[PDB]
Design a protein around this ligand. Structure first.
Ligand SMILES: Cc1ncc(COP(=O)(O)O)c(C/N=C(\C=C\OCCN)C(=O)O)c1O
Ligand SMILES: Cc1ncc(COP(=O)(O)O)c(C/N=C(\C=C\OCCN)C(=O)O)c1O
Ligand SMILES: Cc1ncc(COP(=O)(O)O)c(C/N=C(\C=C\OCCN)C(=O)O)c1O
Ligand SMILES: Cc1ncc(COP(=O)(O)O)c(C/N=C(\C=C\OCCN)C(=O)O)c1O
Lengths: 390, 390, 391, 391
């Protein structure tokens, strides 16, 4: 009972922005234009490219492609997911209030809490997975609501349309959905009411663990113009080569994501029947408390699997160190399988008390299940878990 | 009469950061490491790389090299010069004041005036080429002084040592020198008393018009810690590949800059004796009002030449359109000769009344003299001036 | 009834040659080492890297991965598919005979026929889809037997094990299978008895239409050493950056190939029941004359679909011009769907009378079916054939 | 008293092939086009490019640039210097004879001696610095004369114009000058009567020790057509990214080479008055036997310096291992200073007897003087020689 798959996604992934008639050569694959600058026929004419930071062919093609996948009119590429976040935050002004989902990427939490807040911005962390708590937290000063769904790393799921409805009822408030964990193949926040669909393109979008990049998709004309002004003005922009690599990565997004789904489901089911696993959190399992909502707003699920190992931090460490195919490393969304302990690694930057409230304990482990053979991945988890409880 | 050239500069540019012993293969040129993430031996210990945004081999090699050329302990690389400015500005907090050199790159002007100033930062533009005016403008809230020298585009020259003394006498104020126009081959702000030596590496540093990048060199330990936190936390970071190309650009910086000097001087001398030129501003000309100061704090001069054409905007435009070797385009500091009209191009983002007070008029033309044959460059300027004045 | 898929393929494609422990940084993805040269501690002893052309980490990492995917001990990367052919041909010497499959890529034809033949090498083109013909064509001077299966573009299928048995009965004769059309995901010539498995990596291996490259995988120690000598000595070597890009492409080879199969089969089934198609040639269709053999030596089929449109060259040209999704262009094996007319494009380099004999006529169209939505591809083909509506 | 410098060289290096009007974006630097294939308006009717191996925008831009710098009509780029050599040799046919300079890069030696010779090609190695010897070596079968000047590594200098007169007097013989050591900034073989000017672009041309590549410049129309055929048909082609990086390298070629000249001259003179040094071979020194010829056919000299250390192999090894700034490594022509012992490294591929005849002993050391500070370079050589301190 998942949402039906988005029509023409693959066709668009491979072709939007990639029209050969853009190039004098009629190249089937867009060239990588590194050039910082472009010849102009007259001073002050507004006909064509001018300066790479402001706009450049390879970035522009990638932005077109991503926009289409998001069902968006526009998209803006950035130097990283965090830099996308920073740029979006600069839409605001001193005196403004930001509401942020209480469970998010550690660095996002850090940015709002320790940086943005220093500049006249008030930050409230709210469990938006309970729509009425969101409602209760909105103030006349609220200008931005930042959510992940599923959240990193406890994978709480948020009713995007329900949040949209509440957020847009009064005033002028921007709803951002960081769609990093799902990719637009599986979830389209703009279709559900968000004003912005945002990515760490570093993860599934590129999918090849070799590009650090952020993406921001948007429909609203005024909102886009404001964002485009800041892309140019803050200059947190991606290399044109990275744009090329990410675009290239996009061409297999659909077949990569389907295999992440299959492998992730297999891993989740395996862990849930494992005697050395205390609890599994995976949107595609009925055991996930928002599983039905997941099927309502998503076309499938990804490779991210969270689980609590039995025992203590020491068991968690022995498990991680015994993995032979999963790699103990940060990040996610690549072809290769990764494994992490968020409380000590990606989410060390989250306050202890917040970690405890959120349940990011010493025994919470986060998996990014890759595209390897399913049997090899299950064998690796099986032996590492036995190694941990001898 | 210039400062003696900095010793070992070429040796350092070619070898700092490039030690083959860093790589298991003993490669003489550092590999390009795109990997977003790195395998860790145990959860949460910090004895290697962890995530590309935070640090990565190719970026770290570049930073090491640039720090050396600046005579600095540390350097941080960014996605663009503007992103370097953005990151430095995040060192501050609401309530703080910034003094900016009155003549700067249009985008820098724009960032402080229209963006930074919305987040609790007060911005004052001051002609710091008159140290008296800088002294008067410092308040108890001043935390940062941003200068360019020579300025873009009217090439006013600031006494860096003099300003450092004024700024550091009073409290804890950061002095930044945007050293984009001179490069570290010709000027070392940190040796002169500046706290930060900053670049749009997009220009001479890379030197090849195919990389957008910022660079920030510093000595002070806590200033570095704060900047490094912001590199990682705002994530306005460069591609490892771009880092490679910039590093590669650096291996010829010395021989490129010496040729920029000779060509620049020859072009400046030619224009000044040309009957269709009203005024030439080139720090290497005795006519430059700070010529003696330039020899006191620089080892030589670059290829940036500013001049005013006799006549009106129509004459400037006809000149620019009849250039056949110089290219009508924005940016600077490449091997290829570039020409532009700042009022209508790079500095259109400066308010027209500021442009008039600064002298950035319809007839101010900025040249970035490249590395082509001298006689070819002079002949192009000659015929184009005649074209504008038949 | 296809052969079972090869075990641990995806695991190997993603991890072989990619061990983080190779690098001081412990990078999960191998760095791109551009460096031409390497600091040595031992002049005259070959215990480290020395010179990029001879060997370098990014190429070596790639070669290891491909070798594993081929079930091979060794693999050598080259500047292009044709460069791999040229290097393999340098294994021989004046007075040797090459036997080449009568239907091969036009440039392979051209190279043997117009170039190799000028340097003391006898070339015979033989229909090796008939084993008796190979058998009867072998002479005492035969040193090399070069096959494609399925052939480009008429897609005759060759019994690899049967030819291997025939060829090795005579002794020192190298059997090469150019496995460009299948990829190691669907066909493993080395497990079938071939001495060499070769690729234009430009096609499916890389898969992203942005790298020109050749690959040669081998088991024999002696044969490997001879090929490695020629990799170094002829220097038709690929850029380490290209090597990085191809190896990146490898990591989606399994999921790419499965979708090419799905899309290819659907395209083939649609064309075969279309009133405007004369004949379809697709290994996965029961109508294919070697279908049973395909199932016996392959684990599946790819996106390469060949067919004859009814009518004349004019109908082929109206069909091609009306395609809105398929792109008229040479090459194959990329994420993007392509169509071409071999007689005028990729196989213009085959002499017209040879073209006639092989059936590469003015109505032969070759499709490389990409990874787009099936429905969209089928619709594109449908409306383009209606545009042409030949008698 | 050198040749006056070639006019507009820098202007051409920076702009030839780089016209912004080529690109819809009007980019000042040509884009890197990785695309293997290109959309056609109709079968066999393309917009200029068909397939990357055959031609691509980024390679063509580079080829145009290099041709200009050589003063040539045409240029072809290849995967490596060896691959350019292989491709040129394919111009010939069984029964043809090749004369090769007796002192050349070891791989060039090896290719002719062990590979080319196996395919009906006769190889003669001849000291062409004595023109009567070349003339005596010419037979009716002679079709190709391959010279380096200065030679790698003993830097014998050949009278290119003298040799052109002799060779062309005797009929349709192709004279190739491998101009790797000099670069077209300092030497133009085509203006001196050579038919081909050839490079390992891997060295000074790229200049940055991060690209393996070959280049071939040529004026003769029929010669161009034949080479172009072989570029496409053999496929020993460079990555477009490598082409980009090589073009990028070119734009600093003039300022790089002037500095290689200054530093190289300083190193040569330092070595020549050093007590632990037996002999120095540098074209820029009056002590070089062909110094006066060097000034007649060149506009300056490069960073390649050859010397004999006093003592034995032991002493040469200790010298090399004690270098702190020079890097003990192969290759040459980079920004970074390199040092090697040819007899057991780059020229181990030369037969030991041939090595003795040529003077490539265990004490011949080859320096590639890079662009570092002169005093640091000299200081490094000084402490290293002191470290070995032979008799
Ligand atoms: C959901 C989400 N949004 C935004 C970002 C920031 O994107 P970036 O700037 O890195 O492109 C991340 C990074 N997520 C991780 C990155 C970790 O890096 C290690 C430093 N904590 C992770 O492993 O969970 C993320 O998981
Ligand atoms: C002195 C100086 N500092 C910083 C920057 C910003 O660096 P970036 O973010 O571009 O790396 C520039 C850009 N200067 C120019 C760039 C212009 O193009 C953009 C349109 N204004 C110029 O040509 O004057 C600069 O000239
Ligand atoms: C089966 C096969 N082997 C080898 C090659 C040569 O590989 P390369 O050198 O291109 O990497 C090809 C090229 N096949 C095609 C090449 C077309 O190129 C255009 C020039 N005809 C094709 O589309 O059929 C091929 O199809
Ligand atoms: C004059 C000359 N021509 C051609 C080549 C071959 O070009 P390539 O295929 O490498 O692009 C070389 C290589 N020269 C050296 C190559 C060393 O490689 C290591 C093995 N010899 C050298 O250091 O002397 C050369 O010096």
């Amino acid at each position: 009972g998942f949402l039906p798959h988005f029509q023409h996604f693959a066709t668009q992934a491979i072709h939007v922005g990639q029209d050969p008639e853009q190039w004098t050569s009629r190249a089937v694959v867009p060239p990588i234009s590194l050039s910082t600058t472009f010849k102009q026929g007259a001073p002050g004419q507004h006909s064509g490219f001018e300066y790479s930071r402001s706009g450049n062919p390879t970035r522009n093609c990638l932005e077109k492609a991503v926009a289409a996948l998001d069902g968006a009119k526009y998209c803006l590429a950035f130097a990283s997911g965090l830099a996308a976040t920073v740029t979006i935050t600069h839409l605001l002004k001193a005196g403004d209030q930001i509401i942020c989902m209480d469970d998010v990427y550690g660095g996002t939490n850090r940015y709002f809490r320790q940086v943005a807040s220093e500049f006249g911005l008030k930050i409230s962390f709210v469990d938006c997975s309970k729509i009425k708590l969101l409602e209760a937290a909105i103030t006349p000063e609220t200008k931005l609501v930042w959510i992940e769904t599923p959240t990193n790393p406890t994978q709480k799921v948020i009713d995007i349309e329900g949040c949209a409805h509440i957020v847009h009822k009064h005033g002028d408030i921007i709803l951002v959905v960081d769609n990093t964990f799902m990719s637009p193949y599986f979830q389209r926040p703009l279709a559900l009411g968000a004003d912005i669909s945002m990515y760490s393109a570093t993860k599934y979008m590129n999918g090849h663990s070799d590009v650090v990049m952020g993406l921001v998709s948007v429909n609203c004309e005024s909102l886009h113009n404001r964002l485009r002004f800041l892309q140019n003005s803050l200059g947190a922009v991606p290399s044109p080569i990275d744009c090329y690599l990410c675009n290239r990565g996009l061409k297999t997004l659909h077949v990569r994501m389907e295999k992440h789904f299959k492998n992730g489901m297999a891993v989740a089911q395996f862990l849930e029947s494992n005697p050395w696993v205390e609890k599994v959190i995976y949107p595609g399992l009925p055991s996930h408390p928002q599983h039905e909502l997941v099927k309502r707003q998503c076309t499938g699920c990804t490779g991210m699997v969270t689980f609590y190992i039995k025992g203590t931090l020491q068991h968690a460490e022995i498990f991680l160190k015994n993995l032979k195919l999963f790699t103990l490393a940060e990040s996610l969304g690549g072809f290769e399988s990764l494994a992490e302990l968020p409380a000590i690694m990606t989410h060390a930057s989250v306050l202890k008390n917040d970690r405890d409230v959120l349940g990011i304990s010493d025994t919470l482990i986060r998996l990014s299940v890759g595209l390897e053979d399913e049997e090899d991945l299950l064998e690796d988890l099986d032996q590492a878990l036995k190694a941990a409880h001898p």
